[PDB]
Design a protein around this ligand. Structure first.
Ligand SMILES: [Mg+2]
Ligand SMILES: [Mg+2]
Lengths: 140, 140
């Protein structure tokens, strides 16, 4: 009984920290990380090599992504008849007001800005894990 | 169950001595050394070629390092949510009250003034080894 978390992020530093914070969970989880919007969609639509990759229970989405940005990934996921139910938490350095408004308008479940202080960000990821992987009841 | 010690030192003479002082161990220790602060942080943050280097269980840090001093190394280590728990033993020749104050202020675990005579320095390293790698209960 393990939940899968799909992290779409390219910053290796953040990837490391995020993976470390999620690793210190009270319940083991599976974290799959892809580094660009393209891979993100291919993985979620189980296209190609990602033929048998199981559906994630939670998606953590960075916005400024290579190839295809998070804004586009979000719009395509929340518009898809089947992927739209997967909770998406945008976790980004962006404090841009347009990004905030647009993300919620596209039905993102939640928007979180990456802290400037590593330890703070670490605690934020812990909050994400505790609330979504423990307190909330996820679909399916 | 072997212990991994990370030595940040540029004085080849001290490196040789410390290495030897840590060779005696029923369960062989894994000693890794780097000669400068830049290399130290890259290694600890698992950047690039160090992407797969395991986290040490103890760090021994020199202050007057090339291209990036131990002061900065200490601050960056103690501010990182994934490295801040690794015990850091500052082992330097400095007896400067300024270095002592700042090092403890930055959360160094302990500060040790190297002993001139290579032999006494040996007994000091043995003290470090017994207390930290045997007496204390490490987070690792
Ligand atoms: Mg990015
Ligand atoms: Mg030096």
């Amino acid at each position: 009984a393990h939940k899968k978390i799909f992290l779409v992020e390219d910053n290796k530093a953040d990837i490391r920290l995020i993976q470390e914070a999620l690793a210190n969970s009270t319940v083991p989880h599976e974290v799959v990380t892809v580094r660009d919007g393209m891979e993100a969609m291919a993985y979620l639509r189980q296209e190609g090599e990602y033929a048998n990759a199981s559906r994630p229970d939670l998606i953590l989405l960075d916005l400024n992504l290579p190839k295809k940005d998070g804004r586009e990934v979000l719009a395509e996921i929340k518009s898809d008849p089947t992927l739209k139910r997967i909770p998406v938490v945008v976790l980004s350095t962006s404090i841009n007001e347009d990004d905030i408004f647009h993300s919620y308008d596209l039905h993102v479940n939640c928007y979180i800005t990456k802290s400037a202080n590593l330890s703070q960000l670490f605690q934020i990821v812990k909050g994400i894990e505790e609330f979504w992987l423990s307190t909330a009841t996820l679909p399916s």
